[PDB]
Design a protein around this nucleic acid. Structure first.
Ligand SMILES: COc1ccc2nccc(-n3cc(CCNCc4ccc5c(c4)NC(=O)CS5)nn3)c2n1
Lengths: 487, 186, 487, 187
DNA sequence: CCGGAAGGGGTAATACT
DNA sequence: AGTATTACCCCTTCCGG
């Protein structure tokens, strides 16, 4: 028998688990902004055609594909990740278009896998734009049967537009969501000022973005936390809900809370204020009710006592309750596979570098495809100018191989374009078809020249990145929700 | 003194209150998200409720779901039943359109008929026209949860004795009688 | 608001539920021998490609396709049905080849859906043989998106070979498994003696099959129950497990139960024996042990006190424990959507007509396909003898439509064959390929003649059915397990 | 007084008994189907077990799985530990091959070290080398790990106790930084 | 208690405020 | 305590014989 030391096996197993949980469980990817579970679910839904053109598909099916081909983990984890990606209050720009009971901001759970149906969103189509064009690396899955992308093309900055909070071993990350237009402005500055140093680009992008933008809306008070987060990665964005006073016929005034800070659990806030009223820490409040509905949104009514002022009750709510809290933002992300704390300029630069690499790889693949198409068309047209001789040789040839040899000898043809000549259809012999063949050869040559020019000049590919991202923003842009105010 | 799964309303008088009974917590959440919380209460269940006509009284009252229904209704059973309580003057049995939903609706109807006969007699029981977990708040409110546009089937009694015979042959323990009934009425 | 009568609504809802449960939940189909869930799982494994040619696939994936496409019910029910179909002790001829933990005869439960991966079996391929050739009818699924078969082709008598017991509303069916060779002999007699009456058919088929054959083997004592089941459908087949007596070096004796009756739960029989010994009903047994293992099979060893006779203890076990039980056979099945009780001759005849109509439909479909191919090939040949005229005409044609009209004029061709010669490859221009075209035209004409001959003579169809059944039975035959003995 | 889900062996003496600890009923069924029931016992778990090092004694003595483990073992905890009561002279932790199996093995080893240190120092604890164990059927599972003649098991041993509890504390304690530094240098 | 069906809860690690 | 990834599982009903 062979012994193993307790400490050696302990450290080993725990370090393996910790590294796996860090790299591929919870921390997001700087290039894509997605955890591996989200990446796998999105790719499965895309490959499975669940796309906005097509109708929705049962979430159970997509979870089963993610489990069978890509993600070797429990169905509950995959399903809850999908539901979170389909949640408007949890994602600034949702990646999945869901149908059914996908949850509530409070304590209601999502419906079962057999009740909810999910397809992709146009945002998810920009997420997976031109993935099949060798833009991104592909690796075999756990059983090696199928291939999955290491990263998505990520034509829009998901990591900063939606953020990613995740708990890992030894470290936790919490990136707040932002506005897409501010991100676009920052990346445009980074693209045009591609030679700027770290300090200049940091100042510029801090000027471009005002601060975190949460799907829950609400308010942000102060700027020291946001500035510290953008300059170091570790900050504390003090967020607060929205309150307003309503007058009644009898003279009673009620605080109408219509917005709550980010990640605040509804229907837990209400029980918390009820408990604080009962035991007694929040004196001034008489009645609490939830008029929140599907048609009017979140609306909590707090009817206060006559011997009370709105300001004092509001301040007590801020200090004692979750109506005002803090976002302990920590900008931890996976870069080259390792966890790093990144300021805003680093995030913008990494996204820009990823976009440039993706554009270059796409252009190389398109150039290779155009080269092959042009070569085949050139051989075919060289056969076409000798159509009568080619037809005579194909007639007189006993079999196909003798015809291949004859064509190769006749027209200095390589076996590939001779093979194409054999597959050449009869209807292609119409004059319009031959003219289309000449013009297609000309167009393919022009496209080859254009692609070579693009590959030669980096300013060209920077322009393509700017144009595509501007197109994305204009078509999927929205106004800012949370208003940043001073102390 | 009320079931934990019950999502009660904010109204106090039973005259303007109503209890939507659903057979699942997924359907329960879908209905509660799209309800008028000031007037409507949601009571989820655990699927198939016990058969009252095919079990002894102690075993029936031991079951958790029927106990939840009784306590949420607030009233007693059999002789001690008093219509004064009736927490909700409108008990809407809300089940899916598939065959299993019809079976659960029949089981709940026989349970109410055996235990709360004056409830059914007073016209306080209604039937809805919607799996339900595939509906979000919007269409759920628009179709059957909006009081101004919804339509409901109110259960009524014409002849009590024939109802007792029908309930006995369908939910009792006489297998060949229900065999003949289903063969004739198919 | 509309008033609803209580009794009318109760009767309507319960009648609908009962009819659904009878027709399409638990009662097997006479032609297929499968319940709708089993049929849907089989077709899902077939359409998705989970076949014995390739490797296995995760059961979660197959359950997901079944649930999303065909079976709108809980995943637990579908998985349980799949596991039962993959169970040797539950099915005489298993229809699914599973890998993982699909349970044990005792109280062990099957592994979760994410741990077991299952494909089809060759017998399942005979079940789904030539389904795509319009052999069986197809219907839209529950949401009307895809097509699913009402009945499988069922090239062997699955209903009698595996049996199907199920509980429904008002009725419950129980059919015992049989031997494939005996069923083959019965169907062969039915095919040859297709003009026989009910009495002679029943007598012959009763002679052909000795009795039910259970996957657990064992014994069947008596013949009155089996005979009454075969002539009426309602019988009582008394099974008895295998018990042996062995000696010990100390002079002790111990009864070894190596076989138990059908549907008897292991690990509950043992506890039943233990509790009967504890209270005291079977005085004589001193100790109980379960020497059962994966390498020795079922083995329950009960050692007996000195002052007892093995025969009296064996009779006590037979009378009081599950060592001897009864099969309450109720030959109830769905015929044309109606629940009916059937004697054995009725089952054989129904399977015979199913095979006959399947063969007729297959041959009609093949004849139509061969006629279309012959039409295309005749057009291609008749355009082939005018090869230079056709090529010259297609050359002068400005557009493909002009060439099509010219070919119509030149050869008196219809639209589809004109398309066919338009899309003809240049490889077909070679002499060998033209010769092959003529040869295949001749062969396809011969096939058309043979298929019309098969349509003409019903005796030919009966012959084909007999040969396919004989080939299947030779491929997948086995010796009988249960031994029928006298009282 | 034995755990409900334990499947014990037919052997009487503890000198020739084995307790295979698995983390689920799906793996437990496969283990018990393909075992030598005369000598080998199967004890299933609920997956992630409580962290003994990051919880108070009352809670870790309230959790169900640790109660099942100590009852199946039968011995005491801390001072009241008695080796003579031990039901099985071989406790084999047989977890899945993924990283989560390694995490569960670490949790169980931490529990045993902090509660049954003797068990470890007497060399009575083994680890087995089999995406999970519910995908393995009886035959090959018996052939690799459950067959005593051919199986290979890693026997947990103690070299220095002091370094052992130091590593256990900085890896399972509440001092995050300590383990941050540790994993950063030793990954 | 056997075959399909309905429905669902509950512990645990993991950091950080 | 809760936030999001993970490990993992049990337990009532109906329906005939
Ligand atoms: C409630 O108390 C307990 C106690 C112990 C429990 N032990 C196990 C499971 C339990 N519950 C599970 C669920 C939800 C059902 N799941 C819906 C679903 C749909 C499709 C698929 C699928 C799952 N799984 C795939 O792999 C692909 S398809 N509710 N309870 C449970 N619950």
């Amino acid at each position: 028998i062979e012994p193993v030391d307790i400490e050696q096996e302990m450290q080993r197993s725990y370090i393996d688990y910790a590294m796996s949980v860090i790299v591929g469980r919870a921390l997001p990817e700087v290039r894509d902004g997605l955890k591996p579970v989200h990446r796998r679910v999105l790719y499965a839904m895309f490959d499975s055609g669940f796309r906005p053109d097509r109708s929705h598909a049962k979430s159970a099916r997509s979870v089963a594909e993610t489990m069978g081909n890509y993600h070797p983990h429990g169905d509950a984890s995959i399903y809850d990740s999908l539901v979170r990606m389909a949640q408007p209050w949890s994602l600034r720009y949702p990646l999945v278009d869901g149908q059914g009971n996908f949850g509530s901001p409070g304590n209601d759970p999502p419906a079962a896998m057999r009740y909810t149906e999910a397809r992709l969103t146009p945002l998810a189509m920009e997420m997976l734009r031109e993935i099949d064009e060798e833009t991104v690396d592909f690796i075999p899955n756990y059983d090696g049967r199928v291939q999955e992308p290491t990263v998505l093309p990520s034509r829009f900055p998901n990591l900063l537009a939606n953020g990613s909070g995740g708990i890992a071993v030894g470290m936790a990350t919490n990136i707040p969501p932002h506005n897409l237009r501010e991100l676009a402005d920052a990346v445009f500055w980074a693209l045009e000022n591609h030679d700027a140093d770290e300090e200049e680009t940091l100042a510029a992008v801090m000027g471009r973005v005002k601060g975190p933008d949460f799907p829950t809306a609400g308010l942000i008070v102060g700027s020291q936390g946001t500035a510290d987060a953008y300059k170091t990665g570790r900050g504390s964005i003090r967020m607060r809900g929205v309150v307003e006073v309503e007058e009644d016929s009898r003279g009673r005034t009620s605080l109408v809370i219509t917005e709550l800070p980010y990640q605040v659990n509804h229907d837990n806030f209400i029980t918390s204020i009820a408990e604080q009223v009962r035991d007694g820490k929040l004196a001034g409040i008489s009645n609490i009710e939830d008029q929140s509905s599907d048609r009017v949104g979140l609306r909590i009514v707090i009817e206060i006592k006559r011997d009370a002022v709105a300001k004092v009750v509001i301040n007590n709510l801020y200090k004692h309750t979750q109506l005002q809290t803090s976002f302990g933002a920590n900008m931890l992300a996976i870069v080259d596979g390792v966890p790093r704390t990144l300021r805003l300029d680093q995030l913008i630069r990494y996204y820009v570098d990823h976009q440039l690499d993706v554009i270059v790889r796409r252009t190389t693949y398109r150039l290779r495809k155009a080269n092959e198409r042009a070569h085949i068309l050139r051989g075919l047209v060289k056969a076409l100018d000798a159509l009568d001789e080619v037809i005579a040789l194909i007639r007189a040839s006993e079999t196909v191989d003798i015809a291949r040899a004859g064509l190769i000898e006749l027209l200095d043809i390589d076996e590939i374009q001779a093979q194409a000549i054999l597959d050449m259809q009869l209807r292609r012999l119409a004059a319009l078809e031959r003219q289309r063949i000449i013009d297609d050869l000309a167009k393919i040559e022009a496209e080859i020249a254009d692609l070579e020019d693009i590959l030669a000049k980096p300013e060209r590919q920077r322009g393509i990145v700017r144009d595509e991202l501007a197109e994305i923003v204009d078509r999927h842009g929205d106004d800012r929700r949370t208003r940043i105010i001073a102390i | 003194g009320l079931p934990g799964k019950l999502a009660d309303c904010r109204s106090t008088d039973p005259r303007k209150s109503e209890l939507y009974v659903v057979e699942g917590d997924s359907a329960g959440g879908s209905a509660k998200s799209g309800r008028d919380s000031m007037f409507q209460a949601i009571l989820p269940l655990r699927g198939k409720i016990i058969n009252v006509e095919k079990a002894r009284i102690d075993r029936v009252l031991k079951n958790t779901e029927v106990q939840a229904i009784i306590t949420a209704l607030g009233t007693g059973i059999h002789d001690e039943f008093d219509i004064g309580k009736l927490r909700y003057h409108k008990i809407v049995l809300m089940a899916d359109a598939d065959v299993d939903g019809q079976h659960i609706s029949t089981l709940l109807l026989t349970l109410l008929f055996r235990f709360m006969r004056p409830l059914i007699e007073n016209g306080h029981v209604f039937l809805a026209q919607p799996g339900l977990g595939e509906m979000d708040a919007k269409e759920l409110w628009e179709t059957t949860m909006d009081p101004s546009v919804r339509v409901l089937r109110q259960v009524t009694l014409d002849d009590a004795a024939a109802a007792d015979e029908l309930f006995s042959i369908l939910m009792g323990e006489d297998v060949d009688a229900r065999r003949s009934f289903i063969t004739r009425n198919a």
